[PDB]
Curated annotation (Swiss-Prot), chain C:
Induction: 6-fold repressed by starvation. The RNAP catalytic core consists of 2 alpha, 1 beta, 1 beta' and 1 omega subunit. When a sigma factor is associated with the core the holoenzyme is formed, which can initiate transcription. Belongs to the RNA polymerase beta' chain family. The gene is rpoC. This is DNA-directed RNA polymerase subunit beta'. The chain holds residues 102 to 150 of 1316 of the full protein. DNA-dependent RNA polymerase catalyzes the transcription of DNA into RNA using the four ribonucleoside triphosphates as substrates.
From Swiss-Prot, chain D:
The chain holds residues 397 to 445 of 1178 of the full protein. Belongs to the RNA polymerase beta chain family. It comes from the Bacteria. The RNAP catalytic core consists of 2 alpha, 1 beta, 1 beta' and 1 omega subunit. When a sigma factor is associated with the core the holoenzyme is formed, which can initiate transcription. Interacts with CarD, TRCF (Mfd) and RbpA. The gene is rpoB. DNA-dependent RNA polymerase catalyzes the transcription of DNA into RNA using the four ribonucleoside triphosphates as substrates. Changing V27A: In strain: vr1; rifampicin-resistant. This is DNA-directed RNA polymerase subunit beta. Changing F43V: In strain: RJ37; rifampicin-resistant.
UniProtKB/Swiss-Prot annotation, chain E:
The RNAP catalytic core consists of 2 alpha, 1 beta, 1 beta' and 1 omega subunit. When a sigma factor is associated with the core the holoenzyme is formed, which can initiate transcription. DNA-dependent RNA polymerase catalyzes the transcription of DNA into RNA using the four ribonucleoside triphosphates as substrates. It comes from Mycobacterium tuberculosis (strain ATCC 25618 / H37Rv). Belongs to the RNA polymerase beta' chain family. This is DNA-directed RNA polymerase subunit beta'. The chain holds residues 346 to 394 of 1316 of the full protein. Induction: 6-fold repressed by starvation.
Curated annotation (Swiss-Prot), chain F:
This is DNA-directed RNA polymerase subunit beta'. Induction: 6-fold repressed by starvation. It comes from the Bacteria. DNA-dependent RNA polymerase catalyzes the transcription of DNA into RNA using the four ribonucleoside triphosphates as substrates. Belongs to the RNA polymerase beta' chain family. The RNAP catalytic core consists of 2 alpha, 1 beta, 1 beta' and 1 omega subunit. When a sigma factor is associated with the core the holoenzyme is formed, which can initiate transcription.
Length: 49, 299, 49, 49, 49, 49
DNA sequence: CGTATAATGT
């Protein structure tokens, strides 16, 4: 429910960062200029986020 | 600091190349490429010549590096002129360096022309392509980028001649572009505003704070979607089953692709004129009985 | 390298390596080489040659 | 004058006319900015005379 | 900036550019990550329009 | 180019850290703390921390 | 897409 006895902050090893991620961002495009839809594997990719 | 300065010293480390040096290096690198080509075709591979061929390959690679290092200065001399156009100077230099390697990959010394003349065109090409693809956060097609630059240059020249800013119609006459196309092109030219910019100094509140989500009512969407979709499916089921298939195909409730009157007639073997009457029957049926009671809403 | 840990007052990375900020900065921005490991035993064994 | 100096030192010398030299974009841009954004160009409050 | 510079480095390292080119590119990548995690911490902060 | 392997960049620092051990460094710092050398004593104190 | 007189350190 809402039991959070303590709260820890620690350095994030590279392995941890991959675990959090749901994918990889591989292109610098942001959104298409006509459909105004997030582009594939881009910074707004619908597959990843 | 000053990452530009450290790179500038690095490129200045290598001295310039003369015409005699350029041709000598060009011959050496060509031999190295030819030697590397010979590696994969010498089926009866020699023993000592194999080591000699490998040594020449290293020599050719060394010549390639030395030629590139010397020629980096041309790239900087060409990249300097494009600064201040939404791309960092050092980023432009790296894009030009990509152009340099690309040009060197296709360089030929048999024509007797200096490497600078042939490289300049490629360096130019690479830098301008880079700028077009990267300089804008919302990547526009290269075609649009070229058209925008054309309009901007024309607008500057026309304004200088007129002495006053020109309208879309006047620009269209000068540039031979449709007026609506110019309006759309101008809108594309806009560089998006930043949300972090404080607005009206309203308690140092960024513009993004005032943006209204005003969307994403998931609870409302789910109930409406469930009710309407289920109601129509059940109502279509109560109708003739073949007509239910007709609605699915005529429309695409399952697979999209709304079948036209002739097309659906072809699939069912009927004529193009029968579909209108079929739809007339469906609409008439849907407006009577319990179907109306269920579907009176949703309008 | 994460910006926080170097270029700090103190620079946590510097103390861990016992390196002054000048040395650490030069290594990061490729302004100067640095030696990672040297095979001391091999150097001693073949020093005469 | 910075623009005109650059143009003067680079443009042709035989058929140079002041119209092609003098530019009006910076001046008009400057004056417009002053009346549109300067902290000393305030909406005249007209609650009463 | 980070994604674009990293992608260029991936392409550039595959191409086989000389040492100075790759070294400069990695310097750009490190600078971009520096700006991302903290802008203005070191050097002149990257500025907007 | 036989014994010493000197790399340049954050990759060099990464390899230095992974090769670098902490048990021996900690023990040496503690031993130095037991001794005097005030100015170097506090430098070792901060490092040991 | 290769544009060939030549063009080499913010």
């Amino acid at each position: 429910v809402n039991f959070f006895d303590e709260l820890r902050i620690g350095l994030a090893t590279a392995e941890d960062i991959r675990q959090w991620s749901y994918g990889e961002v591989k292109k610098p495009e942001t959104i298409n200029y006509r459909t105004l839809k997030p582009e594939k594997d881009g910074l707004f990719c619908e597959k990843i986020f | 600091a000053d990452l530009v300065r450290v790179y500038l010293n690095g490129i200045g480390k290598t001295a310039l190349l003369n015409a005699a040096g350029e041709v000598e290096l060009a011959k050496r690198i060509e031999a190295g490429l030819y030697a590397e080509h010979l590696l994969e075709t010498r089926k009866r591979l020699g023993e000592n010549r194999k080591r000699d061929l490998a040594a020449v390959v290293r020599d050719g690679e060394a010549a390639r590096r030395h030629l590139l290092e010397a020629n980096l200065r041309l790239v900087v001399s060409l990249a300097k002129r494009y600064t201040g156009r939404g791309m960092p100077l050092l980023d432009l230099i790296q894009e030009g360096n990509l152009g340099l390697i690309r040009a060197m990959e296709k360089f030929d010394y048999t024509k007797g022309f200096k490497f600078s003349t042939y490289a300049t065109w490629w360096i130019r090409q690479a830098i301008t392509r880079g700028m077009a693809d990267q300089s804008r956060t919302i990547r526009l097609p290269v075609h649009l980028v070229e058209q925008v630059n054309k309009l901007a240059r024309i607008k500057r020249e026309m304004h200088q001649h007129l002495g006053r800013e020109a309208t879309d119609e006047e620009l269209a006459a000068e540039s031979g572009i449709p007026i609506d196309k110019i309006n759309d092109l101008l809108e594309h030219s806009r560089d998006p505003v930043s949300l972090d910019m404080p607005v009206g100094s309203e308690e140092e509140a960024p513009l993004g704070d005032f943006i209204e989500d005003a969307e994403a009512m998931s609870a409302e969407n789910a109930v409406i979607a469930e009710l309407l979709h289920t109601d129509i499916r059940s109502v279509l089921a109560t109708l003739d089953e073949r007509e239910h298939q007709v609605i699915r195909l005529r429309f695409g409730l399952d697979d999209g692709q709304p079948r036209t009157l002739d097309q659906i007639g072809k699939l069912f073997g009927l004529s193009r004129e029968r579909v209108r009457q079929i739809e007339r029957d469906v609409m008439s049926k849907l407006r009577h009985g319990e179907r109306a009671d269920r579907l009176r809403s949703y309008a | 390298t994460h910006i926080w840990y170097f270029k700090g007052v103190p620079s946590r990375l510097g103390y861990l390596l016992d390196l002054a900020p000048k040395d650490l900065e030069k290594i990061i921005y490729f302004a100067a080489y640095v030696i990672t490991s040297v095979d001391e035993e091999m150097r001693h064994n073949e020093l005469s040659t | 004058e910075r623009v005109v100096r650059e143009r003067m030192t680079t443009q042709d010398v035989e058929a140079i006319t002041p119209q092609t030299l003098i530019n009006i974009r910076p001046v008009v841009a400057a004056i417009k900015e002053f009346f549109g954004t300067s902290q000393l160009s305030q909406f005249m409050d007209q609650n009463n005379p | 900036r980070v994604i674009n510079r990293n992608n260029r480095l991936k392409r550039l390292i595959d191409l086989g550019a000389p040492e100075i080119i790759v070294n400069n590119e990695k310097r750009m990548l490190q600078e971009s990550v520096d700006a991302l995690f903290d802008n203005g911490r070191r050097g002149r902060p990257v500025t907007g329009p | 180019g036989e014994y010493f392997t000197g790399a340049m960049g954050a990759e060099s620092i990464q390899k230095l850290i992974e090769n670098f051990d902490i048990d021996a460094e900690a023990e040496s710092l503690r031993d130095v703390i037991r001794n005097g050398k005030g100015q170097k004593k506090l430098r070792a104190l901060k490092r040991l921390k």
